[PDB]
Amino acid sequence: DHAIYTAMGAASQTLNQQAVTASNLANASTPGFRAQLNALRAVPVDGLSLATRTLVTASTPGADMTPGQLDYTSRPLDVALQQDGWLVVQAADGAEGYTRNGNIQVGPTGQLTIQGHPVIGEGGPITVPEGSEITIAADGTISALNPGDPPNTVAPVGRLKLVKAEGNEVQRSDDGLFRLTAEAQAERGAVLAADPSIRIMSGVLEGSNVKPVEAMTDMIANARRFEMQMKVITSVDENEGRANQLLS
């Protein structure tokens, strides 16, 4: 009578896994995206006397840090980081976040943004002089040349804050930015200092890293697992009916 609940848990968590996979597939064109991993954990129910019932719980263990494919766009402000490297932005709630989106934009007032989040440089958010032409070097250095003014007047303005962090040290926040895990925060500090060993390429944008093969295989597996759980539910549903209706 309670195997129906085990099968129902399996089917519901299969639905959750399918939702995760569909959300990953919907962002196949999202610039600088990290796919969410999925794994079904098994929870064994304790008790007496013969432990037979073990339930299923869907989980998302971090994300995927494999870089995607770089689109070469003839623009100086689109940048791509090294493998396992992160650009730093000031998060929505005045905090710090890390990302791979190298689509740096400028405003009328001259401040650099990523998805609207100001970029954080050595001494707090980077601000470029109003209406200047900007070039980004291979180590984060930013040069600004005013339009029409001796090209001998090009001078650096600041340096981007580029950090290095692996998947174990990084957890996705609800606003799409990545942050440090508590166990990584305890060791590497609240704020990560700039890592000078990371090279950055200017003029190339990093796309998403969702793998179509894994997504399609996962969808097929989810469908088949759901059908098997429905069969288990149906088998349990007939037996209980007969039993009660007759042994009364």
Binding site: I4, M8, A11, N244
Partner: protein, 67 residues
């Protein structure tokens, strides 16, 4: 009691009902759970009906104790 689950967020900032960022809130109903709950309730209901039927039969037989 209200079920404890995150409200299902849907991005439709064209519908007249919306949020500040166009996040329409939809109920957190888990369809599989509700179908299984309906089946379980029906089965438990039928079991209780059988209990009542056999109990009434026994009461009649007890009323026919010595006769």
């Amino acid at each position: 009691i209200e079920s404890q689950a995150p409200e299902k967020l849907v991005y439709e900032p064209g519908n007249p009902l919306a949020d500040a960022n166009g996040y329409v809130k939809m109920p957190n109903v888990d369809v599989v759970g509700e179908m299984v709950n309906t089946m379980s309730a029906s089965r438990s209901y039928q079991a209780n009906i059988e209990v009542l039927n056999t109990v009434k039969s026994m009461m009649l037989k007890t009323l026919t104790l010595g006769q």
